[PDB]
Amino acid sequence: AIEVKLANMEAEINTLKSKLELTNKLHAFSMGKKSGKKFFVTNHERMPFSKVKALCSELRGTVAIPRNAEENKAIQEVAKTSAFLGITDEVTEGQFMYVTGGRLTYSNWKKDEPNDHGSGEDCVTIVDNGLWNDISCQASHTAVCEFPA
Amino acid sequence: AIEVKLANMEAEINTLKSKLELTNKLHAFSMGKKSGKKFFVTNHERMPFSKVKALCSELRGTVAIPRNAEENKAIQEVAKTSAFLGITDEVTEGQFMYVTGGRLTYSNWKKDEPNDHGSGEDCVTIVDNGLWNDISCQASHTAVCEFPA
Amino acid sequence: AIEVKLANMEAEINTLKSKLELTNKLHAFSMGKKSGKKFFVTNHERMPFSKVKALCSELRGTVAIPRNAEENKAIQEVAKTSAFLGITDEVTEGQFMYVTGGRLTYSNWKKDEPNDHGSGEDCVTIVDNGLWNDISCQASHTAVCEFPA
């Protein structure tokens, strides 16, 4: 009875949809996501900002963006080394924007930073220290994505 | 068509259920689960007891309960920091019971503990050296969950 | 109804297929898988070679096989202790092969290794500095599986 089978399959679907959902809530917890909080992740791979921005999307995530002191200390914890942030000023030199829109609300630059130094530095990378410094986007640092609370 | 399509989706639900199962195995493996033995998991987020309880449930698991030494240690290694256990005497002061039910059948308290200190301590937290100590349920300690072997 | 419910369902299914392949991509990512590079996993369990060969197969993976300095160091940083490698000379003493077939094309033995010490040593473990040492396939060591790039 086609009528039946369908309903049965709509059941096998929901159960799976519910399982995979559970599988993911346990995968985040595993990855250290705090309760109802945006949490970061990294494979420790170094690459240009175009590839990181890329990779974070394929994983349905955004390039890491510290919107306060905590999230910054937290991003430092994850990468060890230097890693790009979801911040650039490619649109308007000197005017840093989150890859997700909006102007920086929380910052943490180093003395004389940013500075577009040399041929021009449009990407921001937090360095093993917690402070940030602007650098060439064609450079290559630790890829780090974030995921919604 | 209609009948065939309904068939093509049959094997789909199967191959799925089949992949998700394998995927869940790979995870457990990756999160420490040892062969045939239950396994503990944590985000390290310190919190009150009641939360750890709701949290482990949302994940369809339970607050970590050492049922002997190997387990007590296993929880000790994964937590790396003060953590609650599925054990409390909030029912009958003086008698600790598992959240899953029953009376304590294994312990590893430290000198003079439990002491139902101050106004009262009805919650258990594995502490340094893997020893135990009752502390207020309100206090905040690492949430840890266990999933079946 | 029926026909519409079917097209709607087929969509639901393709959605799950994607959501899962995502779950999978995000996991390998957090497990340090570098882009286009085979990643190595572990539960840290120590066991005999035969037991590892099997554990890796149940996950459809294989015993980690370092073929260059990179992969070695990767694995070495995954084990954190000694672990078997998908390499042995069980068939012809002094002619180490890959469990996946063929003679070795790269090694990183310790000094004066391999030595087939005692009753014999036909297996291999990555030890310190990721250096190699042929051991007894019956000795228990960290199980580490590898999955496709």
Ligand SMILES: OC[C@H]1O[C@H](OC[C@H]2O[C@H](OC[C@H]3O[C@@H](O)[C@@H](O)[C@@H](O[C@H]4O[C@H](CO)[C@@H](O)[C@H](O)[C@@H]4O[C@H]4O[C@H](CO)[C@@H](O)[C@H](O)[C@@H]4O)[C@@H]3O)[C@@H](O)[C@@H](O[C@H]3O[C@H](CO)[C@@H](O)[C@H](O)[C@@H]3O)[C@@H]2O)[C@@H](O)[C@@H](O)[C@@H]1O
């Ligand atoms: O400690 C070991 C050894 O390290 C250094 O020499 C080796 C080093 O050489 C080449 O790059 C030098 C590079 O090293 C970095 O460790 C760091 O010192 C860099 O310094 C800049 O960046 C930091 C980050 O905040 C700043 O604090 C510092 O002031 C410098 O920034 C200045 O310039 C920026 C733009 O370039 C600008 O944004 C800043 O505002 C500021 O003006 C230092 O430049 C490489 O061979 C390097 O290898 C790695 O990097 C290569 C590309 O850079 C790449 O091709 C390689 O594959 C590899 O990834 C290597 O480490 C030096 O410190 C030496 O004294 C020391 O003994």
Ligand SMILES: OC[C@H]1O[C@H](O)[C@@H](O)[C@@H](O)[C@@H]1O
């Ligand atoms: O006997 C254990 C160990 O002892 C020495 O380190 C060497 O003989 C090794 O080849 C051997 O595996």
Ligand SMILES: [Ca+2]
């Ligand atoms: Ca510019």
Ligand SMILES: [Ca+2]
């Ligand atoms: Ca700039």
Ligand SMILES: [Ca+2]
């Ligand atoms: Ca600069």
Ligand SMILES: [Ca+2]
């Ligand atoms: Ca009480």
Ligand SMILES: [Ca+2]
């Ligand atoms: Ca008490």
Ligand SMILES: [Ca+2]
């Ligand atoms: Ca106490």
Ligand SMILES: [Ca+2]
């Ligand atoms: Ca032999």
Ligand SMILES: [Ca+2]
């Ligand atoms: Ca040998």
Ligand SMILES: [Ca+2]
């Ligand atoms: Ca040896």
